[PDB]
């Protein structure tokens, strides 16, 4: 099963926010067969739930270093995709 | 070294910020081959030249939807690694 | 005898790996807790107050 879950490596967010982000990423990836389309669906879910505008970076190879705000940040791996999504504003 | 030729197929960002980020990315790629360090340098240069805050990500197999500000989301690839400097705000 | 010994040596190595994993996980958790406490102190009480 395509599980976009995470372990305790670097996950600094509200628990509900992190669970919703992981679930939205997994649902978008299941709904869309393309990476860009899954990104579009996940961004639509993010802009609907945590308001506009929120982005999530998820892929096999990636890297993020920015101003990760408190209770809305993540830098981990969600399945085969590296879940590095931090929301600030 | 590394062919740090940033060909922006889709450049929905400021031309000056994109050119400065491309020059910084070429210098960083000449310095080292760390894509994470290159993305961090691009994000830092974009945030310094266009205020806080700017985020840039470099990877190989990833699909992300940019939720950024206007004239600040530069997606320039030095080859195939799409270094998308989507300055969120 | 050498086969059982190689098995025992692999078992000792794996047990050492597990024990070192426990010790290193405790150390990493303590370091993460201390770093989180310092970051929370900095975020709540700004140094340039």
């Amino acid at each position: 099963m395509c599980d976009r879950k995470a372990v305790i490596k670097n996950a600094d967010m509200s628990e509900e926010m992190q669970q919703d982000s992981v679930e939205c990423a997994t649902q978008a990836l299941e709904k869309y067969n393309i990476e860009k389309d899954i990104a579009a669906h996940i961004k639509k879910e993010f802009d609907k739930k945590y308001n506009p505008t929120w982005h999530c970076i998820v892929g096999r190879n990636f890297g993020s270093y920015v101003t990760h705000e408190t209770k809305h940040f993540i830098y981990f791996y969600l399945g085969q995709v590296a879940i590095l999504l931090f929301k600030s504003g | 070294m590394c062919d740090r030729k940033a060909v922006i197929k889709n450049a929905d960002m400021s031309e000056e910020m994109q050119q400065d980020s491309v020059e910084c990315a070429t210098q960083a790629l000449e310095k080292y081959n760390i894509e994470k360090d290159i993305a961090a340098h691009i994000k830092k240069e974009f945030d310094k030249k266009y205020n806080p805050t700017w985020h840039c990500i470099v990877g190989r197999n990833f699909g992300s939807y940019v939720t950024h500000e206007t004239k600040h989301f530069i997606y320039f690839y030095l080859g195939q690694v799409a270094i998308l400097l989507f300055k969120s705000g | 005898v050498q086969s059982k010994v190689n098995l025992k040596y692999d078992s000792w190595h794996k047990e050492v790996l597990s024990k070192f994993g426990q010790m290193l996980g405790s150390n990493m958790t303590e370091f993460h807790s201390q770093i989180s406490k310092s970051r929370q102190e900095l975020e709540q009480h700004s140094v340039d107050t």
């Binding site: 670097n10 096999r60 270093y65 990760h68 830098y75 | - | -």
Partner: peptide, 17 residues
């Protein structure tokens, strides 16, 4: 006003192995 929280989540991201 509200400031900007510089609580960076530092973790090195490796490629697929």
């Amino acid at each position: 006003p509200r400031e900007i929280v510089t609580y960076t989540k530092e973790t090195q991201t490796p490629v697929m192995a």
